[PDB]
Amino acid sequence: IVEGSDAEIGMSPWQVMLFRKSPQELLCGASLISDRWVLTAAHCLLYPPWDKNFTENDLLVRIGKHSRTRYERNIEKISMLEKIYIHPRYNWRENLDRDIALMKLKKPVAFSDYIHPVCLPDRETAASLLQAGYKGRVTGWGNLKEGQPSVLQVVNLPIVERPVCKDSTRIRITDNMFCAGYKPDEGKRGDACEGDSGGPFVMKSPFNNRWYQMGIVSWGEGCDRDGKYGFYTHVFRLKKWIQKVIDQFG
Amino acid sequence: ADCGLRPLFEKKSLEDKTERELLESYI
DNA sequence: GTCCGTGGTAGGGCAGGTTGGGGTGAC
Ligand SMILES: *C[C@@](*)(O)[C@H](CCCNC(N)=[NH2+])NC(=O)[C@@H]1CCCN1C(=O)[C@H](N)Cc1ccccc1
Ligand SMILES: *[C@@H]1O[C@H](CO)[C@@H](O)[C@H](O)[C@H]1NC(C)=O
Ligand code: NA
């Protein structure tokens, strides 16, 4: 996160840390969607241009965490992965279209003050909340500019109108992605950056007091550049896919 | 079922520092 | 009014799958 801030304790309790075991490595963020399922970006698991294709036994997941260094005893939980599921239509060459993946934990995780799943949108959440100018919140332990924070960073960013997202880059934008960030003159700044992929873009519905993951940090071009916008995987678009794999293989 | 309601916040009628900004952007 | 499935990220093929819906629809 660039131009973000230290999160408050328990502010993002569906936040999940995705790890490479050996050599140890903070790979990406992710999100807790039930006691046995984690959402993340596919490019965190699978990216053939860097000969990156992780197996469940390569990775480890950390939940409930606040500070990136310290083990937090009786606070954080570790999990192993049973299976990874990448979207069959995920495109690693052209534009990270459908950059989404699901991870099934080996054991379920007990919830706590610090470990709590976020909701997914349905048609009405998408209808009501996906509007230019409306802000969501992004969270991660990735780059502060294009070192690395000690504490989870948080920033609020407005959804940007689609033509503006299209125009601002040469990568072929897609219906399964949206972009968010401040326009050059709007004063305010901020963006996700590398190491933040998989983290969630949440929005608090003003109708129930509930948080919804509308996006997944996916890509950008540098971080926090003027006229550049962070890109996020469109969660609701891919809702039916999420429900099927959970239902069928849960 | 209980999704999106944070123990340290919604559950105990507390706001975090900047959630109001989000609300205001919906206006 | 028109347009979003036949390879592509990729097989076996013209459905349907964990996958081509229907919407922040775009145009
Ligand atoms: C894996 C994620 O941490 C990372 C997120 C970067 C988010 N940036 C901003 N400014 N919000 N994603 C990536 O790094 C992806 C995967 C590999 C390359 N990549 C990019 O975003 C490139 N910078 C641009 C790109 C290359 C190919 C296809 C799409 C985008
Ligand atoms: C990634 O690895 C898995 C397990 O080894 C393999 O079966 C799969 O085909 C690989 N996928 C790639 C390289 O796209
Ligand atoms: Na920008």
XYZ file of C-alpha atoms (C1' of nucleotides) and ligand atoms in Angstrom:
349
model
C 0.000 0.000 0.000
C 1.239 3.458 -1.058
C 0.078 6.478 0.953
C -1.938 4.248 3.251
C -1.960 3.932 6.942
C -1.457 1.528 9.823
C -4.668 -0.407 10.283
C -6.438 -0.521 13.635
C -6.454 -3.846 15.497
C -9.152 -6.078 14.157
C -10.091 -3.566 11.439
C -9.689 -6.265 8.686
C -10.206 -9.573 10.340
C -10.698 -11.481 7.025
C -7.177 -10.491 6.006
C -4.917 -13.406 5.187
C -1.201 -13.681 4.527
C 0.014 -16.028 1.769
C 3.496 -17.541 2.313
C 6.201 -19.362 0.479
C 7.600 -21.911 2.894
C 11.158 -22.235 1.623
C 12.754 -19.826 1.223
C 10.281 -18.090 3.521
C 8.567 -15.261 1.696
C 5.524 -12.978 2.081
C 3.990 -13.640 -1.319
C 0.603 -11.944 -1.479
C -2.499 -11.115 0.488
C -5.776 -13.108 0.540
C -9.144 -13.165 2.294
C -11.115 -15.361 4.601
C -14.488 -16.157 3.062
C -15.631 -19.064 5.370
C -13.847 -21.340 7.837
C -12.301 -23.535 5.142
C -12.051 -21.183 2.133
C -9.597 -18.414 1.202
C -9.808 -16.063 -1.790
C -6.722 -14.648 -3.509
C -5.382 -13.659 -6.994
C -4.468 -16.474 -9.390
C -1.243 -14.720 -10.459
C -0.021 -15.212 -6.879
C -0.156 -19.021 -7.414
C 0.288 -19.229 -11.167
C 2.345 -16.988 -13.437
C 4.021 -18.904 -16.282
C 6.147 -15.969 -17.523
C 8.061 -16.263 -14.277
C 7.848 -20.113 -14.244
C 5.731 -19.661 -11.107
C 3.288 -22.531 -10.473
C 2.872 -23.205 -6.721
C 1.573 -26.504 -5.205
C -0.442 -26.674 -1.935
C 2.640 -28.006 -0.176
C 4.766 -24.984 -1.255
C 2.570 -22.524 0.573
C 1.412 -21.576 4.003
C -1.370 -19.273 5.102
C -1.401 -16.931 8.092
C -4.641 -15.486 9.410
C -5.569 -13.067 12.185
C -2.347 -11.187 11.835
C -1.630 -7.532 12.376
C 2.145 -7.017 12.480
C 4.214 -8.501 9.645
C 7.233 -9.484 11.743
C 6.056 -10.869 15.075
C 4.406 -14.098 15.705
C 1.246 -12.978 17.551
C 0.521 -15.759 20.111
C -3.115 -16.653 20.758
C -3.874 -14.213 17.976
C -2.694 -15.560 14.638
C -3.425 -18.943 13.144
C -1.476 -20.888 10.494
C -3.125 -23.157 7.877
C -2.077 -25.646 5.214
C -3.876 -25.933 1.906
C -5.839 -28.996 0.791
C -6.400 -27.855 -2.788
C -5.874 -24.808 -5.005
C -8.522 -23.958 -7.647
C -7.646 -21.409 -10.332
C -10.303 -20.024 -12.594
C -10.249 -22.045 -15.851
C -10.476 -18.776 -17.843
C -7.581 -16.978 -16.060
C -5.307 -15.323 -18.699
C -1.704 -14.820 -17.598
C -0.448 -13.485 -21.010
C -2.639 -10.631 -22.163
C -4.225 -8.841 -19.219
C -4.686 -11.049 -16.092
C -8.346 -11.392 -17.077
C -10.217 -13.370 -14.367
C -7.262 -13.080 -11.889
C -8.950 -15.138 -9.145
C -8.197 -18.285 -7.152
C -9.739 -20.213 -4.238
C -7.811 -22.118 -1.554
C -9.300 -24.847 0.578
C -7.684 -25.173 3.961
C -6.812 -28.637 5.277
C -8.517 -27.973 8.644
C -11.148 -25.322 9.407
C -10.178 -22.315 11.468
C -11.929 -21.115 14.577
C -13.081 -17.468 14.362
C -12.201 -14.933 17.066
C -12.022 -11.213 17.683
C -9.241 -11.293 15.067
C -10.367 -13.937 12.543
C -13.715 -13.218 10.808
C -14.947 -13.875 7.201
C -16.122 -11.089 4.891
C -19.333 -11.345 2.786
C -19.474 -11.736 -0.929
C -21.762 -9.484 -3.027
C -24.958 -10.640 -4.794
C -26.688 -8.721 -7.592
C -27.983 -6.027 -5.209
C -24.619 -5.366 -3.622
C -23.185 -4.963 -7.042
C -26.124 -2.786 -8.238
C -25.886 -0.527 -5.212
C -22.200 -0.293 -4.472
C -20.363 -0.433 -7.836
C -20.447 3.239 -8.757
C -17.817 5.788 -9.796
C -16.784 7.989 -6.848
C -17.857 5.369 -4.280
C -14.919 4.360 -2.185
C -13.654 1.052 -0.989
C -10.805 0.028 1.299
C -7.746 -2.015 0.245
C -5.348 -3.706 2.722
C -1.874 -5.307 2.483
C 1.702 -5.750 3.626
C 3.167 -5.032 0.178
C 5.382 -2.177 -1.069
C 5.163 1.292 0.418
C 6.351 2.716 -2.962
C 7.326 1.296 -6.382
C 10.399 -0.724 1.983
C 7.878 -3.055 3.559
C 5.518 -2.046 6.433
C 5.635 -3.536 9.889
C 1.902 -3.265 10.367
C -0.936 -3.964 7.904
C -1.573 -0.894 5.765
C -5.009 0.337 4.816
C -6.212 2.884 2.235
C -9.580 4.146 0.905
C -9.948 4.661 -2.836
C -12.774 5.609 -5.127
C -13.971 3.455 -7.991
C -13.078 5.174 -11.227
C -15.325 5.492 -14.242
C -14.702 2.761 -16.808
C -13.739 4.874 -19.830
C -11.162 6.575 -17.682
C -9.769 3.178 -16.676
C -9.689 2.036 -20.285
C -7.969 5.201 -21.543
C -5.284 5.286 -18.777
C -3.478 2.138 -19.945
C -2.561 0.166 -23.074
C -3.410 -3.197 -21.532
C -6.728 -4.407 -22.853
C -9.149 -3.819 -19.984
C -11.910 -6.396 -19.364
C -15.413 -6.646 -17.911
C -13.967 -8.817 -15.089
C -11.893 -5.994 -13.720
C -12.391 -2.477 -12.363
C -9.967 0.262 -11.337
C -9.785 2.592 -8.407
C -7.744 5.610 -7.393
C -7.604 9.380 -7.285
C -7.405 11.454 -10.441
C -4.148 13.701 -10.588
C -5.837 16.923 -9.371
C -8.134 15.410 -6.672
C -5.450 16.157 -4.117
C -5.519 12.771 -2.311
C -3.301 9.863 -3.411
C -2.757 6.158 -2.737
C -2.725 2.773 -4.371
C -1.987 -0.882 -3.827
C 1.421 -1.960 -5.018
C 3.352 -5.194 -5.602
C 3.089 -7.688 -2.729
C -0.574 -6.584 -2.259
C -2.109 -8.909 -4.873
C -4.892 -11.073 -3.466
C -5.811 -8.568 -0.781
C -9.415 -7.514 -0.672
C -11.163 -4.335 -1.874
C -13.997 -4.064 0.600
C -17.037 -1.771 0.831
C -19.306 -1.297 3.825
C -22.941 -1.445 2.791
C -24.916 1.412 4.214
C -28.027 -0.849 4.281
C -26.848 -3.615 6.629
C -23.776 -2.687 8.580
C -21.819 -5.300 6.592
C -18.485 -5.467 4.728
C -18.411 -6.910 1.223
C -15.358 -7.921 -0.831
C -16.050 -6.306 -4.188
C -12.533 -6.666 -5.586
C -9.230 -8.499 -5.421
C -6.004 -6.572 -5.862
C -4.776 -7.705 -9.289
C -2.490 -5.388 -11.259
C -1.153 -1.945 -12.061
C 1.643 -0.036 -13.769
C 4.044 1.255 -11.165
C 2.251 2.367 -7.972
C 0.508 5.632 -7.255
C 1.305 7.282 -10.656
C -0.682 10.197 -11.880
C -3.318 9.084 -14.342
C -2.514 5.494 -13.483
C -5.139 3.366 -11.601
C -4.916 0.160 -9.577
C -6.806 -2.777 -11.130
C -8.991 -5.226 -9.216
C -10.671 -8.508 -10.051
C -14.512 -8.063 -10.227
C -15.698 -10.422 -7.458
C -19.423 -10.524 -8.151
C -18.837 -11.259 -11.816
C -17.176 -14.434 -10.656
C -19.635 -15.238 -7.866
C -21.223 -18.279 -9.573
C -17.780 -19.767 -10.006
C -16.933 -19.270 -6.309
C -20.255 -20.881 -5.156
C -19.808 -23.926 -7.453
C -16.346 -24.890 -6.347
C -17.243 -24.341 -2.725
C -20.487 -26.360 -3.042
C -18.962 -29.149 -5.089
C -15.546 -29.605 -3.515
C -16.153 -28.148 -0.077
C -24.160 -15.883 7.713
C -22.361 -13.758 10.268
C -20.112 -12.449 7.454
C -18.750 -8.895 7.304
C -19.566 -7.953 10.945
C -16.285 -7.354 12.746
C -16.042 -8.446 16.368
C -13.990 -5.469 17.461
C -16.297 -3.054 15.566
C -19.800 -3.612 14.226
C -20.446 -6.203 16.937
C -19.764 -3.728 19.710
C -21.171 -0.575 18.058
C -17.784 0.954 17.346
C -16.580 2.747 14.197
C -13.057 2.582 12.878
C -11.339 5.877 12.147
C -12.069 6.192 8.448
C -15.244 4.168 7.654
C -17.163 7.459 7.610
C -15.175 8.523 4.522
C -16.668 5.470 2.724
C -20.194 6.416 3.743
C -19.727 10.005 2.583
C -18.545 8.825 -0.837
C -21.875 7.017 -1.188
C -23.445 10.506 -0.973
C -30.471 -0.794 -32.013
C -25.668 -4.043 -31.769
C -22.365 -7.267 -29.086
C -19.922 -10.463 -25.589
C -17.624 -19.486 -27.930
C -14.621 -22.786 -30.687
C -9.247 -20.592 -29.077
C -7.709 -18.804 -25.597
C -4.322 -19.013 -20.376
C -5.716 -24.499 -22.862
C -8.588 -30.157 -24.769
C -11.523 -31.692 -27.152
C -14.402 -30.042 -30.164
C -19.501 -27.020 -31.034
C -21.350 -28.397 -24.944
C -19.890 -27.928 -21.036
C -16.883 -28.263 -17.708
C -14.580 -25.357 -11.912
C -15.501 -22.197 -18.168
C -19.178 -18.282 -23.053
C -23.030 -14.960 -18.070
C -25.809 -10.760 -18.601
C -24.454 -6.589 -16.640
C -21.769 -0.865 -12.970
C -23.167 -3.982 -19.462
C -20.385 -1.416 -23.427
C -20.842 0.531 -27.662
C 0.822 -10.008 -7.811
C 0.371 -8.613 -7.326
O 1.065 -8.252 -6.156
C 0.616 -7.469 -8.314
C -0.187 -6.244 -7.852
C 0.313 -4.906 -8.388
C -0.750 -3.836 -8.094
N -0.341 -2.503 -8.517
C -0.992 -1.358 -8.360
N -0.410 -0.250 -8.844
N -2.177 -1.266 -7.740
N 0.333 -7.879 -9.695
C 1.304 -7.880 -10.608
O 2.441 -7.511 -10.346
C 0.985 -8.329 -12.003
C 1.425 -9.780 -12.132
C 2.718 -9.792 -12.934
C 2.865 -8.410 -13.572
N 1.794 -7.595 -12.984
C 1.545 -6.307 -13.214
O 0.676 -5.696 -12.611
C 2.421 -5.573 -14.187
N 2.874 -4.359 -13.546
C 1.673 -5.141 -15.421
C 0.992 -6.288 -16.133
C 1.727 -7.211 -16.881
C 1.073 -8.252 -17.559
C -0.321 -8.344 -17.509
C -1.053 -7.412 -16.769
C -0.394 -6.388 -16.089
C 1.319 -26.758 -12.412
O 1.682 -27.857 -11.601
C 0.698 -28.882 -11.521
C 1.075 -29.851 -10.419
O 2.417 -30.194 -10.672
C 0.608 -29.583 -12.875
O -0.173 -30.769 -12.835
C 0.035 -28.507 -13.790
O -0.128 -28.991 -15.106
C 0.978 -27.290 -13.800
N 0.358 -26.256 -14.584
C 0.983 -25.417 -15.405
C 2.466 -25.433 -15.603
O 0.345 -24.584 -16.023
Na -3.039 7.134 -9.753
